[PDB]
């Protein structure tokens, strides 16, 4: 029972939102390379089986645990009860796989999947609606906790939870069962400070995505008004240990260590697999992230 478990995400191989990126890379190549690199587990991708027996049939022979899966929320247009029914299939799969977390994100009005929409036109939730949105998220979180699953909210570019102020609003209007998924890459991309977010909310963090960014490319997205998927194809994201990145990982992991964080560190770095070889960059990500966690005192 290692306290800290290192996972990966299959979008470094095949992107979910833009199905042309890594379409040629089979599920088999993705999982073989993820296991060969040394990851303890992997998160859901769009090529994964969604039935317990079939999913174990591909994961267990490779020694990969099912970390979690992304689940889209539509609390801004659907009732809380309908959203509870929507996540139940995901909860069933996670329990059978032994997963302890469900990753969630409000995507009813999100634009990260719209290749033609500039990221600056992303949705902003009207101020008065935060309280009700929070009650809905926490209602889903209490529902999942009753079945042994912890809901972790994934702040994300192109959604209503993008900036550091909006992360603060979410945490303010949720609790006690709602946890935060701290994604370092999305936080900095959204002009936030990963270290400051961790200092504020580490007690509520239940899942960590160690995602890096190339500052050069992020500023290209801003200056030229590009879409999220345009930025992904240009290399807006990369892995821990890449000298082209700008995220400072040790301070964040040090805050986690000081509060006794237990759970997953996941390297999630979508890139164009033709240009940024997934085996190479995910290999560099795992090596570098373990070194950072050792330096931070997080992994003893």
Q: Measuring CA to CA, which residue among 1, 37, 4, 3 is closest to residue 12?
A: 37
Residues in 241-300 that interact with Mn ion by CB under 5 A: 268
Cβ-in-10-Å burial (0-12, 13-18, 19+) of 168 comes to middle
Residue 289 near residue 37, CB atoms below 8 Å = no
Q: How far apart are CA 171 and CA 153, in angstroms?
A: 10
* Residue spans of beta strands (DSSP E) within 48-138: 65-66, 70-73, 101-106
DSSP state letters, 154-178: E--TTSS--SHHHHHHHHHT--SS-
Q: Which is nearer to Mn ion, 82 or 192 (CB)?
A: 192
CB half-sphere exposure, 85, CA atoms < 13 A: 4
At closest approach, how far in Å is the CB of 185 from Mn ion?
A: 7
Q: Which is nearer to Mn ion, 242 or 268 (CB)?
A: 268
At closest approach, how far in Å is the CB of 196 from Mn ion?
A: 18
Q: Which is nearer to Mn ion, 156 or 169 (CB)?
A: 156
Q: Measuring CA to CA, which residue among 275, 272, 283, 274 is closest to residue 11?
A: 272
Instruction: Report the length, in residues, of the chain.
Output: 300
First to last CA, the chain: 13
At closest approach, how far in Å is the CB of 283 from Mn ion?
A: 19
Q: How far apart are CA 103 and CA 182, in angstroms?
A: 11
| Site size with Mn ion, rule: CB under 5 A | 3
Q: How far apart are CA 182 and CA 173, in angstroms?
A: 17
At closest approach, how far in Å is the CB of 82 from Mn ion?
A: 26
Q: Which is nearer to Mn ion, 5 or 96 (CB)?
A: 5
How many whole angstroms from its chain centre is CA 21? 18
In this chain, which residue has its C-beta nearest to Mn ion?
A: 209
Residues in 68-107 that interact with Mn ion by CB under 5 A: none
Q: Which is nearer to Mn ion, 226 or 265 (CB)?
A: 265
Beta pairing class for 150-154 and 4-8 = unpaired
Residues in 174-213 that interact with Mn ion by CB under 5 A: 183, 209
At closest approach, how far in Å is the CB of 266 from Mn ion?
A: 7
At closest approach, how far in Å is the CB of 184 from Mn ion?
A: 9
CB atoms within 10 A of CB 274: 11
Q: Which is nearer to Mn ion, 209 or 214 (CB)?
A: 209
Residues in 25-44 that interact with Mn ion by CB under 5 A: none
Q: Which is nearer to Mn ion, 52 or 289 (CB)?
A: 289
Q: Which is nearer to Mn ion, 183 or 195 (CB)?
A: 183
Question: What token pair was written down for 262?
Answer: 């237990």
At closest approach, how far in Å is the CB of 154 from Mn ion?
A: 6
At closest approach, how far in Å is the CB of 211 from Mn ion?
A: 6
Q: Please, what's the largest Cα pairwise distance for the chain?
A: 50
- The binding site for Mn ion (CB under 5 A) comprises 183, 209, 268
């Amino acid at each position: 029972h290692h306290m800290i478990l290192y996972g990966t995400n299959p979008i470094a191989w095949s992107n979910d939102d833009d199905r042309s990126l890594g379409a040629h890379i089979t599920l088999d190549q993705c999982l073989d390379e993820a296991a060969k690199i040394g990851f303890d587990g992997i998160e859901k991708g769009h090529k994964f089986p969604q039935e317990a027996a079939a999913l174990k049939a591909v994961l267990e022979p490779r020694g990969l645990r099912y970390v979690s899966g992304w689940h889209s929320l539509n609390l801004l247009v659907n009732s809380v009860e309908e959203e509870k029914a929507a996540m139940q299939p995901a909860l069933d799969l996670l329990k059978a796989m032994g997963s302890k977390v469900i990753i969630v994100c409000e995507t009813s009005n999100a634009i990260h999947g719209d290749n033609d929409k500039p990221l600056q036109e992303r949705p902003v939730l009207e101020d008065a609606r935060w309280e009700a949105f929070g009650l809905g998220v926490e209602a889903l979180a209490a529902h999942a906790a009753a079945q042994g699953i912890t809901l972790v909210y994934h702040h994300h570019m192109g959604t209503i939870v993008e900036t550091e102020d909006e992360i603060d609003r979410l945490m303010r209007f949720t609790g006690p069962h709602t946890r935060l998924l701290l994604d370092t890459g999305h936080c900095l991309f959204g002009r936030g400070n990963p270290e400051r977010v961790a200092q504020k909310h580490i007690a509520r963090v239940g899942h960590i995505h160690a995602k890096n960014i190339r500052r050069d490319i992020v500023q290209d997205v801003r200056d030229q008004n590009l879409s999220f998927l345009e930025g992904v194809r240009r290399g807006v994201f990369t892995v821990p240990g890449d000298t082209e990145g700008s995220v400072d990982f040790v301070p964040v992991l040090k805050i986690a260590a000081e509060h006794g964080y237990q759970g997953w560190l996941v390297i999630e770095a979508e890139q164009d697999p033709d240009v940024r070889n997934p085996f190479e960059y995910q290999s560099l990500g795992l090596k570098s992230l373990k070194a950072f966690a050792r330096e931070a005192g997080l992994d003893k």
